[PDB]
Structures are given as C-alpha cells and as structure tokens.
Write a protein that binds this ligand. Structure first.
Ligand SMILES: *[C@@H]1O[C@H](CO)[C@@H](O[C@@H]2O[C@H](CO)[C@@H](O[C@@H]3O[C@H](CO[C@H]4O[C@H](CO)[C@@H](O)[C@H](O)[C@@H]4O)[C@@H](O)[C@H](O[C@H]4O[C@H](CO)[C@@H](O)[C@H](O)[C@@H]4O)[C@@H]3O)[C@H](O)[C@H]2NC(C)=O)[C@H](O)[C@H]1NC(C)=O
Ligand SMILES: *[C@@H]1O[C@H](CO)[C@@H](O[C@@H]2O[C@H](CO)[C@@H](O[C@@H]3O[C@H](CO[C@H]4O[C@H](CO)[C@@H](O)[C@H](O)[C@@H]4O)[C@@H](O)[C@H](O[C@H]4O[C@H](CO)[C@@H](O)[C@H](O)[C@@H]4O)[C@@H]3O)[C@H](O)[C@H]2NC(C)=O)[C@H](O)[C@H]1NC(C)=O
Ligand SMILES: *[C@@H]1O[C@H](CO)[C@@H](O[C@@H]2O[C@H](CO)[C@@H](O[C@@H]3O[C@H](CO[C@H]4O[C@H](CO)[C@@H](O)[C@H](O)[C@@H]4O)[C@@H](O)[C@H](O[C@H]4O[C@H](CO)[C@@H](O)[C@H](O)[C@@H]4O)[C@@H]3O)[C@H](O)[C@H]2NC(C)=O)[C@H](O)[C@H]1NC(C)=O
Lengths: 77, 333
C-alpha cells in the first residue's frame, strides 16, 4: 500500500522533470518484485490465486499503470 | 462363548502346520494375486528430486486353499499381527526410493480370511516413488509418472498379477487435488517383463500428471512480460533525454536478472533449456537488445534523422516481440 501511494506521489512531483519521474517510476516497479516473491515462498504453489497474490497483482498493475500514465504525459512534454 | 471358542479352534487349525516358506499351490499353476489400490493422497511432486510422494491403501487378494474354512459363515478379520505368520506375495515397487508402512496405533495391516480361502491382505503404504521427469517444456509440460509393481523372487510360472476389477481396481484418484498438478488421466497396465532369469509378472499404474499453469502464469510469465513492456517505454522518452532513457534500460536489465535468480528456486539443473528458461532468456535478451538499440541511437546522435530511426524502432519492437511470443506459445501450447 505504501509503495502504491508513493506511485501516486510521482504524479504530484512535476512533468517538466523527466529524469526524476523516470527514476521514481522504475524504482517503484522494482520494489513490487521482491514483495511478490517474499509472499509466495511460504504458501504451496496452488494454481488459483490465494487472494493475497490477487491483492499483490492488483497493486502491481496499479504501479505499472502509474508508469504507463507517466509515459503518456511524457510524450506530450 | 461357544461361537468365539469355535472360531478360535478354526483359526488354530488354519495356522497349524502352515509353512510360510511355500507359496500357495506349490508345484502347481501360478497363483493369481489380484491387486486393488485406493490412493489416499498424492503430494509433494518434487521436480527437483524427480519423484513424488504417494500414500495409498494397497490391497492384494489371492486364493489359498490351506486357509479355507467352512464352519464359520462370516468373514474372519484376524488381527493385523497374524500377517507375519502367513505367506504373502513378495511384491516390491521397482521405482521406489523409500517407503514405509504407517506406524500408529499399530502397524497398519489387514488380514481377512474368507470362507473359500481368499485372503484380502492390505497395507497403508507411503512411498516416495521416483519418475524420470522430462521437464523440457516445463511448466507447459505433462509427466507420465508411474508405480511399477513387480514380484521380486517368483517368476510368471509361480505368481501372476492382475488388477482386481480391472479399470475399477484403482479408486480415489479423481478426488485427489495436488497443488500444481491436475491428474488428467490414469492408466492400468499388465505386463510380463522378460528378464535374464525369466518372464516376471508386472503391473504398472501410471498417472498422466499435467502442470497447472495458473501459478506459473501468475508469478513467472506475468512479471517478465510486464518488465519487458517497460523497456519499450524508453523509446517514447526520446533521445535528448539520454540520462532518463539509459536509467530506464538499466533498471529493466537488473530487474530481469533479479527475476531469474529468484525464480531459479525449486528448479533442477537438467541440461536442456526449460520452457520457462527459454522464455526468460528471450525476454532478457530482448531487453538487452533494447539497451543496445538505445546505444545505437546515441551513437547515431553523435555522428532529425535519428528521430526517424527512433520512429521505426518504435513499431518494430512490440511487433517483433509479439511475433516471438506467439511463436513461443503456439509451439509450447
Ligand atoms: C465376505 O465377503 C464377500 C466379499 O464381499 C461377500 O460375498 C460377496 O459380496 C459381494 C458384495 O460386495 C457380492 O457382490 C455382488 O455379486 C453379485 C453376484 O456375483 C456373482 O458373480 C461373480 C462373477 O461376476 C462372482 O465373482 C461372485 O462370487 C458371485 O458368484 C453381483 O450380481 C452383484 O452386482 C450387483 O450388485 C447390486 C446388488 O445385487 C445390483 O444392484 C447391481 O446392479 C449389480 O448387478 C455384486 O457384485 C458377491 O456376489 C459376494 N459373493 C462372492 C464374492 O462370492 C460375503 O458375503 C462376505 N461374508 C459375509 C458377509 O458373511
Ligand atoms: C523388513 O521388514 C520385515 C517385515 O516383516 C521385518 O521383519 C519383521 O521384523 C520384526 C522386528 O524385527 C519381527 O518381529 C520379531 O518377531 C520375533 C519372532 O516372533 C515370533 O516368535 C515369538 C517367540 O520368539 C512369538 O512370541 C511371536 O508370537 C512370533 O511367533 C520376536 O521374537 C521379536 O521380538 C523382539 O522384538 C520385540 C519388540 O517388541 C522385543 O520386545 C523382544 O524382546 C524381542 O527383542 C520381534 O517381535 C518380525 O517377526 C519380522 N517378520 C517376520 C515375518 O518374521 C524386518 O525386520 C525388516 N528389516 C529391516 C532392515 O527393516
Ligand atoms: C505412460 O507410460 C506407460 C509406460 O508403462 C504407458 O503404458 C504403456 O502403454 C502402451 C499403450 O497404452 C502399452 O502398449 C500396448 O498397449 C496395448 C493396449 O491394448 C489395446 O490395444 C491393442 C493394440 O495396441 C489391442 O490389440 C488390444 O486389444 C487393446 O485394444 C496392449 O494390448 C499391448 O500389449 C500387447 O502387445 C505387446 C507388444 O506387442 C505384447 O507383448 C503383449 O503380450 C500384448 O499382446 C501393449 O501393452 C504398453 O504395454 C504400456 N506399458 C509399458 C510401455 O510399459 C502409458 O500408456 C503411458 N500413458 C499413460 C497415460 O499412462
């Protein structure tokens, strides 16, 4: 949740500062990989999402969508 | 106590002068030893160790004229401790790495002398049978794991196996729910393996396991494809913002390496490339190619038209990656 909120704050920063937005977005995406890996280690490899991987995946899509929106605004400049 | 005393006399008569060293009808036709199995559970399919843990009720009925009784009309079910005092098939699981009969409360065995003579020997065996796992297309793979059942000493002339009830001999496989394997089908076979010594009797129970792609599609492929998509975004960033673009590519490549290392867990080291290995390599080399594309763009910058080269590079990458992805999936799916 905290990482997702950090993704939103990337919107708040600015649009003219391309490098800052880029760095923020890429690192935000990086964190979720470790977070997802850690959760799954305890559980057995059940095919169906256990509703924890569901939340993690939705948050992953949210931060990835933040990156997508960041790229979209970057195009216009 | 007349009934129970009479039953005691009958059992004493049966075990009187009973030579465990001799198979039924010695110096005679082979004894037909029917088998029926009830798979209690199949769990811990260890791809790394190439074996699966099987828990089952292993019944094996056979005829025996010595134990025939007629005074008692009902089916005696003697204590499980009498098995040691009776002959049994010298059955052994050929592809068993380690197995044991469950201990508590007492040794889980069954004996049931029917009036004709039929004996319903049964055991609750947990065995870690091993099946050579062909993980070339893993995770999009099937496995034909089996439990070869064979008589160690006796030859086909002395003992013969057969599934009792035929396709109904094995039960309960449908109820089994392995975490990541769907038991698509099970097949029962009867063979007479021809060894150097002679033709031994054989039975084979093979479960054609199929991998559940839901967990692998959840964790393996999805993050990788997402990371790969990120790489294309660097093409949108334009070339004047060199630092941001190269930062993006750098993050992508290191992310791919982290993915590979963390996914390596619970995987053996078979030499051939696994399907997961192939796809990870494809995405990783594609990300590296994206970085190299940025390098080419910058080198061309040092040497207007650079933007046009960027324009073509835009469309090519999603299209070529999509073609590669479709080739991969259709080849494997
Ligand atoms: C000690 O234990 C034995 C073993 O269970 C008991 O005797 C057998 O009990 C089974 C019940 O599970 C009986 O099974 C039924 O047999 C009927 C006739 O089978 C004859 O033919 C076969 C060859 O096909 C022989 O092997 C067999 O010995 C018999 O000679 C079948 O017609 C039955 O099928 C029908 O079941 C129901 C009810 O009839 C129907 O609704 C179905 O549609 C189906 O048509 C069934 O399979 C078996 O017959 C018994 N006899 C044996 C094995 O010889 C003893 O009773 C038990 N001792 C006790 C309780 O004291
Ligand atoms: C592989 O698996 C086989 C499976 O059978 C094992 O073989 C059995 O092993 C057990 C334990 O070693 C044997 O049990 C032993 O039976 C002996 C003989 O019992 C008969 O004779 C006595 C009188 O001497 C009668 O009272 C009895 O009713 C029988 O008629 C016993 O003397 C043994 O007693 C010893 O162990 C007990 C444990 O409680 C001690 O309290 C005693 O003091 C004494 O030390 C024992 O009960 C069994 O008989 C074997 N099977 C057969 C068919 O004989 C293999 O051991 C196993 N091997 C490996 C390597 O895993
Ligand atoms: C997983 O891996 C196991 C490996 O053990 C596979 O088991 C083998 O399966 C194949 C085919 O399913 C077996 O090969 C043959 O199957 C025949 C099936 O009988 C039907 O089909 C034949 C024609 O094919 C008809 O004539 C017959 O009437 C039936 O309709 C058996 O009949 C074969 O045995 C005969 O031929 C051999 C060779 O000629 C003779 O030696 C025999 O005496 C007999 O006359 C033969 O068994 C093979 O036997 C199985 N066991 C092995 C290879 O050890 C599984 O199929 C595979 N898949 C799954 C899902 O488990």
């Amino acid at each position: 949740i905290m990482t997702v909120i950090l993704s939103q704050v990337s919107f708040w920063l600015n649009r003219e500062s391309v490098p800052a937005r880029t760095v923020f977005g890429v690192t935000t995406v990086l964190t979720m990989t470790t977070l997802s890996i850690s959760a799954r280690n305890s559980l057995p490899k059940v095919a169906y999402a256990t509703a924890m991987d569901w939340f993690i995946a939705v948050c992953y899509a949210f931060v990835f969508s933040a990156l997508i929106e960041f790229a979209t605004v970057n195009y216009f400049t | 106590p007349s009934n129970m005393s009479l039953v005691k006399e009958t059992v004493d008569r049966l075990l009187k002068g009973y030579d465990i060293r001799l198979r039924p009808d010695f110096g005679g036709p082979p004894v037909a030893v029917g088998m029926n199995i009830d798979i209690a559970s199949i769990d811990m399919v260890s791809e790394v160790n190439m074996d699966y843990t099987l828990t089952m009720y292993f019944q094996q009925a056979w005829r025996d004229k010595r134990l025939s009784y007629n005074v008692i009309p009902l089916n005696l079910t003697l204590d499980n401790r009498v098995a040691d005092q009776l002959w049994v098939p010298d059955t052994y699981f050929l592809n068993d790495k380690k197995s044991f009969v469950h201990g508590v409360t007492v040794k889980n065995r069954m004996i049931r002398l029917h009036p004709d003579g039929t004996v319903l020997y049964g055991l609750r065996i947990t065995t870690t049978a091993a099946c050579m796992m062909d993980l070339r297309r893993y995770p999009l793979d099937e496995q034909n794991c089996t439990l070869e059942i064979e008589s160690y000493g006796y030859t086909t002339d002395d003992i013969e196996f057969y599934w009792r009830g035929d396709d109904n001999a094995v039960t309960g496989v449908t109820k089994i729910e392995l975490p990541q394997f769907s038991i698509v089908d099970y097949k029962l076979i009867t063979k007479k393996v021809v060894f150097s010594t002679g033709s031994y009797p054989r039975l084979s129970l093979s479960f054609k396991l199929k991998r559940n792609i839901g967990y692998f599609i959840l964790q393996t492929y999805m993050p990788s494809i997402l990371i790969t998509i990120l790489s294309w975004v660097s093409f949108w960033i334009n070339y004047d913002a060199s630092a941001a673009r190269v930062a993006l590519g750098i993050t992508t490549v290191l992310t791919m390496t982290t993915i590979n290392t963390h996914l390596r867990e619970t995987l053996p080291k078979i030499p051939y490339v696994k399907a997961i290995d192939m796809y990870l390599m494809g995405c990783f080399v594609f990300v590296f190619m994206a970085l190299l594309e940025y390098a080419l763009v910058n080198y061309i910058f040092f040497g207007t038209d650079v933007n046009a080269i960027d324009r073509w590079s835009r469309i090519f990458f999603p299209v070529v990656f999509s073609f590669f992805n479709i080739v991969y999936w259709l080849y494997y799916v």
